[PDB]
Amino acid sequence: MEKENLIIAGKPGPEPEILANMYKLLIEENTSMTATVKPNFGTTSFLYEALKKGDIDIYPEFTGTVTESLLQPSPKVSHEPEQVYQVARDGIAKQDHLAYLKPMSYQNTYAVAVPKKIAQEYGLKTISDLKKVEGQLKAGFTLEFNDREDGNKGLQSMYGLNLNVATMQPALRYQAIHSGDIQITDAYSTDAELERYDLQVLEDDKQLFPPYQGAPLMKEALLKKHPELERVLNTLAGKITESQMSQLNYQVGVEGKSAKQVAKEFLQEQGLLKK
Ligand SMILES: C[N+](C)(C)[C@@H](Cc1c[nH]c(=S)[nH]1)C(=O)O
Numbered sequence: 115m116e117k118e119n120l121i122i123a124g125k126p127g128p129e130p131e132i133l134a135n136m137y138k139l140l141i142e143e144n145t146s147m148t149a150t151v152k153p154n155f156g157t158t159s160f161l162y163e164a165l166k167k168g169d170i171d172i173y174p175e176f177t178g179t180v181t182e183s184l185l186q187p188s189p190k191v192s193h194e195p196e197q198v199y200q201v202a203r204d205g206i207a208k209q210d211h212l213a214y215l216k217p218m219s220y221q222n223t224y225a226v227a228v229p230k231k232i233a234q235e236y237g238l239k240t241i242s243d244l245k246k247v248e249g250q251l252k253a254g255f256t257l258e259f260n261d262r263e264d265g266n267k268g269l270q271s272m273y274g275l276n277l278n279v280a281t282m283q284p285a286l287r288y289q290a291i292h293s294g295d296i297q298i299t300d301a302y303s304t305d306a307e308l309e310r311y312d313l314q315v316l317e318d319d320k321q322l323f324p325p326y327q328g329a330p331l332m333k334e335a336l337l338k339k340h341p342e343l344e345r346v347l348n349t350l351a352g353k354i355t356e357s358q359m360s361q362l363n364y365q366v367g368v369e370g371k372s373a374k375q376v377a378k379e380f381l382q383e384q385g386l387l388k389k
Pocket of ligand 1: 125126156157158175176179222223224258284302303326
């Protein structure tokens, strides 16, 4: 008699769309609620604010992003993913009363990336190596990465790097680095574009980037209304490897397949969804 509909959003990209449709498929099979997925609905701070204000109900957030962008002041965390999740989970509950569920296994980190030929021609192995050639190479970064302390501001503070940066739209940066307009971009480690374009990830030798694992973020009030959401979505906890997410991103972003159908097929193959 109550078929409440949940709004599930995801940041720009095939990956959050896949994850949101996974949440929707799981919720509709195992609960009495429905869900609407809002693709590419906004960047981190928009979804975070929409969640607190109640314009959306759930979105997938990443552990290092909670501690680095969402928590103010940002706590000094280790590199161990489980401890970082605990700080994020406990921290985001105290600050904003948000229930951060348990993470999936794969990490999706910011990844400073250059074409393989650029790495070989310039002797680039680590992020530190970029200081050698910061006057010769052009970088194209998302605005959010430019805005973040664990992004370009961290490249400046932690490495002393002063890159020549053009601010880029997220969906256009890979084509620019492939075409030669830029030689450095802020890749995401599960992005299918890394292998497609023969990009090489530079090693985070100073460990600017914390761990990033994804998990559902929602108001505590929604969990109180619907406690079954915790068990239902936590079937993803500790699941989905890096290579599994990458192939799903490839299926949606590159092969043009429906995010819902890709999500559904993977869930069924893995035994989390009927049929
Ligand atoms: C996965 N990630 C690399 C840690 C980022 C990706 C991202 C940040 N902003 C947008 S849009 N996407 C994030 O979710 O914070």
